[PDB]
Amino acid sequence: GTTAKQAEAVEDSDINPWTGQRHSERYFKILKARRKLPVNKQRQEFLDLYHNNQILVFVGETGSGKTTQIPQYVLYDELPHQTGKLIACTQPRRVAAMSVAQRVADELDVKLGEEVGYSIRFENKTSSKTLLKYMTDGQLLREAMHDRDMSRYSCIILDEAHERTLATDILMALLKQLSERRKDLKIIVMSATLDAQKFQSYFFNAPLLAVPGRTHPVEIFYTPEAERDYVEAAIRTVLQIHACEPEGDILLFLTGEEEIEDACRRISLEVDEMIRESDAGPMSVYPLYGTLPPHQQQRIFEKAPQPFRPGGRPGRKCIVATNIAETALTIDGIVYVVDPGFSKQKIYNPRTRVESLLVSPISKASAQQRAGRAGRTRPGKCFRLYTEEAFKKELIEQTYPEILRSNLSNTVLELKKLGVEDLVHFDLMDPPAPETMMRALEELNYLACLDDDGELTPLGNLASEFPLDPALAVMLISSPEFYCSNEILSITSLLSVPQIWVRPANARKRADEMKAQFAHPDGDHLTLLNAYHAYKGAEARGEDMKKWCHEHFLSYRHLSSADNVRAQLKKIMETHGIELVSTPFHDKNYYTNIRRALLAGFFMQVAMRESSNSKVYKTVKDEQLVLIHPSTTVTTPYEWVVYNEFVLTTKQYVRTVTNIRPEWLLEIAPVYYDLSTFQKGEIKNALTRVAEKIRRQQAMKAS
Ligand SMILES: Nc1ncnc2c1ncn2[C@@H]1O[C@H](COP(=O)(O)OP(=O)(O)O)[C@@H](O)[C@H]1O
Ligand code: BEF
Ligand SMILES: [Cl-]
Ligand SMILES: [Cl-]
Ligand SMILES: [Cl-]
Ligand SMILES: [Cl-]
Ligand SMILES: [Cl-]
Ligand SMILES: [Mg+2]
């Protein structure tokens, strides 16, 4: 219908065709620079491929013009169809969606929020005029829960699709299904660091449009030898650039909040020393991480300070960021990128069902994306703080997908809320193994989160609101029925983080002496509760909690994580009308209530002692032979125990163990422990004798 040549004549017009206003002089200066971008040379090739194909794979270099120009090309092409629909472009980070939408609003000569806008979690900067909306992929996924056919959008552009986050992979699977349902919906998948053929084959052998060329080069520099202290090498590199290199701002990639703020303190102190001793320029230092407020995140676009004198050494800006700034951003003024090659990446412990963060080496794709923050408006340089051979042989090509590094049972419940019926045949790009998916569906059905037809129950919908492994969420939801919901709230939070115990090899006797203060002989779960209670009591006394945790050989990081999780879980209970209850401590049933309440989440992790004096236990699930882990505080374990973690070393253990009574299993999980259909064996015979001894006693007193 409309060619690239026809659209360019409308772009050259004195009048804005979207608003009716006169085009500003800033618009024409930007348009002049935009047409020199590498993607503009293949605009008609894009439009021809967009007309004749439903799904398109787009590859071009960092800064070539993918995120800014391609949605504007679609916008000029899509308007005469009069659909009243929107164009969606998903960014990985909130700061990318806000920054790009402001830039494209300037490029279209419109006001941000009116014709170009953004939509993030707590801010919908859109209106009825909005035709192009940049957003996070999590925001589009939240919209798909209420609108499964994506009815507000005519084109959905999945940007930075190489990242393979949980939201990106799920969006790609939903949009692949929707493309067979909705032929009036276009899909564009783009990145600079993409496995193009893998993405093409996944999207029904979609065509590839590859744009070559760069606006400006990025020179890559490697170190001649490996260096362990990457923070020290990062700070040294930043100061060496400020002392010797010409004008240009620095972007430094670090891994977390505490590491960044400490490095920002160290860089500023050394800069203050270089100023008074060497006539160096001023350098402003900006931190950037996800927990920063957005107005303080936006400060990274501020101009570098002026030099101290005419002809003096240049003033400079140093941004110290996580991988929140790894992709999409155009920070004008940046010339230098420092890449230590590390990031906090999510791992999943399958034995504890705990997601946590681990400082890990980055992928080759991530290193190319970090370098691509330079070379956008001027030439750039990237200092990789690792050898060239380490780049070529030690870094993986792409980071492993998040769905294979996450709690799959949490993912299944979210997919049910998104309307996925068949989980076994849900076509993800890199699906989990069918045994792993069937294991998650089996556990969720036994936990009554999915019914026997696979459909979501009200308990499973409520459990999915909690940022927890679903067995922990079921235990928390069920805890008012055991009159100990305040203590289960604490235990659930502690079980959602890694273990708090710190036992260094040179001070293991002192660590055991501190642990014995919290030891409860009837359960490791109560020992965990005592340690958190002592942590909160010392915090209420105004004590240095980093010092307190160090002197008590506890992890301040995991304890403060659990305390922060406990506040989040307490809001969700109060929101959904779930009472916060405690039994008085001197009540005779105080501890038995908490040990009973554990079985509402963990009735499938139960072991029975084999003989009268044996140390060997047999698990209810899969009949494994185990010992009680020697780190337990349970000095005399009962015949029946509940456990948190299966441990496979040179011996097989169950860790985090609490004494239970076997009649509690029949009371709390009677469907799972239905003896009329239970698996035959020594475990069933023992539970049969327990049920018979209950029946013998109730028939006696009734007579
Ligand atoms: N905020 C901005 N300020 C100045 N120039 C910008 C800005 N955003 C984008 N540009 C220019 O437009 C180019 C293309 O940016 P963008 O479309 O985001 O690229 P891509 O997504 O392909 O990496 C940049 O390399 C730069 O030259
Ligand atoms: F590929 Be670009 F840097 F978003
Ligand atoms: Cl974000
Ligand atoms: Cl968001
Ligand atoms: Cl001074
Ligand atoms: Cl972050
Ligand atoms: Cl009950
Ligand atoms: Mg982009």
Residue numbers in the entry: 60 to 762
What does the published report state?
They all belong to the helicase superfamily 2 (SF2) and share at least eight conserved sequence motifs (motifs I, Ia, Ib, II, III, IV, V and VI) spread over two RecA-like domains that together form the helicase core. Two RecA-like domains, referred to as RecA1 and RecA2, build up the helicase core.
A structural analysis revealed that a serine in motif V is involved in polar interactions with one of the ligands in all structurally characterized catalytic states. In the ADP/ATP-bound structures, the mainchain of this residue interacts via hydrogen-bonds with conserved water molecules constituting the active site. The side chain of the serine additionally interacts with another water molecule and two active site residues when ATP is present. The interactions in the ATP-bound state force the serine mainchain to adopt an unfavored conformation, enabling the mainchain nitrogen to hydrogen bond with the catalytic water. As a consequence, the C-terminus of the motif V helix is disrupted. Summarizing our data show that the serine side chain is dispensable for the function of motif V and instead has a regulatory role. Instead, the mainchain is sufficient for sensing the adenosine nucleotide state at the active site and this sensing function is sensitive to the flexibility of the mainchain.
